[PDB]
Write a protein that binds this ligand. Structure first.
Ligand code: 6QB
Length: 348
């Protein structure tokens, strides 16, 4: 059937010549050749059925990506799984192959201001579409941004992503420990169940910083250190910013901390375009409600060369509570995953 570092990819005969790209807790991604369409593809093997969270993430990613269509968001081309649900252990998501990700590119190349600007434009062009659909991506970082050699960029991995119908108040109903640590907005630590899509803008800020310096701006060692790295640079929150924190436990936890001074952006990035540091500052703002939104970040002067509302799609049918109905046993989620992938099956 064809094996990569001990992982069977039951994808033949259509998909062959598999090479490792990466892996995660419950799956693996490889490049492959599509013999039918005569194109290179990526194939993400997911093995989620043992755990309810893994089934949730798999269902979310499939439900969201199949209803999305945008140049800066990876599409699903095809999905492979067993013809019976008892036989389904693995799901194979087939996507267009991208040459590399931003993480790899930043280990090996100092980016020109022109590249950084185009990349940031494309991230925010994609995020605009995502937010307009009422989705939070919730794990933006360099390794979830794919790059082909023409410097085209696509956001991938909607595993951590979800819908939040703005018709309903999601304070207290949102998963606690979201985003990769270095890219985690302060309100996930201080308002752990009440954050909004603004956490995505924070993540994009961390990425913009990382692009300027080839280094993570807030490389914290653990939960409480990440908040210290952040305050180490933004300086202690203002009194108006503290009074805005509704959780008492978390408000007092801050009021307890020593005072820190703001490090000026231009003293951390003395070579960077000033327009870029201005947008960085509006994106890395402590108070979520004051943090620039995706439309206003595109309209910033730094991206004036690319910003064009007439060529920037938004979701024509924004997602609603019908896409959030996934607080269910893993056996039930397995059924919904089977139903959602049915349309790729011979028959249906
Ligand atoms: C050549 N090259 N080098 C790096 C990336 C590529 N190309 C490529 N092309 C299409 C898709 C992907 C791709 C990668 C990573 N992920 C996430 C990791 O960020 C991922 C989540 C969960 C699990 Cl389990 C996983 F293995 C990988 C994708 O979803 C999808 N990559």
């Amino acid at each position: 059937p064809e094996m990569v570092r001990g992982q069977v990819f039951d994808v033949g005969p259509r998909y062959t010549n598999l090479s490792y790209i990466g892996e995660g807790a419950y799956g693996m991604v490889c490049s492959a050749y599509d013999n039918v369409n005569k194109v290179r593809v990526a194939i993400k093997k997911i093995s989620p059925f043992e755990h309810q969270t893994y089934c949730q993430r798999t269902l979310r990613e499939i439900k969201i990506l199949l209803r999305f269509r945008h140049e800066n968001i990876i599409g699903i081309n095809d999905i492979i799984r067993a013809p019976t649900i008892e036989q389904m252990k693995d799901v194979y998501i087939v996507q267009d192959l991208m040459e590399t990700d931003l993480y790899k590119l930043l280990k090996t190349q100092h980016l020109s201001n022109d590249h950084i600007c185009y990349f940031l434009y494309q991230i925010l062009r994609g995020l605009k579409y995502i937010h307009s659909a009422n989705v939070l991506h919730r794990d933006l970082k360099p390794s979830n941004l794919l790059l082909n050699t023409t410097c085209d960029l696509k956001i991938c991995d909607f595993g951590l992503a979800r819908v939040a119908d703005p018709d309903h108040d999601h304070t207290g109903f949102l998963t606690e420990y979201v985003a990769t640590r270095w890219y985690r907005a302060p309100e996930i630590m201080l308002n752990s169940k009440g954050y909004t899509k603004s956490i995505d803008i924070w993540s994009v800020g961390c990425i913009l910083a990382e692009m300027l310096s080839n280094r993570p701006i807030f490389p914290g060692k653990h939960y409480l250190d990440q908040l210290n790295h952040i305050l180490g640079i933004l300086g202690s929150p203002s009194q108006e910013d503290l009074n805005c924190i509704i959780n008492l436990k978390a408000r007092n936890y801050l009021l307890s901390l020593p005072h820190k001074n703001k490090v000026p952006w231009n003293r951390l990035f003395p070579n960077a375009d000033s327009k870029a540091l201005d947008l960085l500052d509006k994106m890395l703002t402590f108070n979520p409600h004051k943090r620039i939104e995706v439309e206003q970040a595109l309209a910033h002067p730094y991206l004036e060369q690319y910003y064009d509302p007439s060529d920037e799609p938004i979701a024509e049918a924004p997602f609603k509570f019908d896409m959030e109905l996934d607080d269910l046993p893993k056996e039930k989620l397995k059924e919904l995953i089977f139903e959602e992938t049915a349309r790729f099956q011979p028959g249906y």
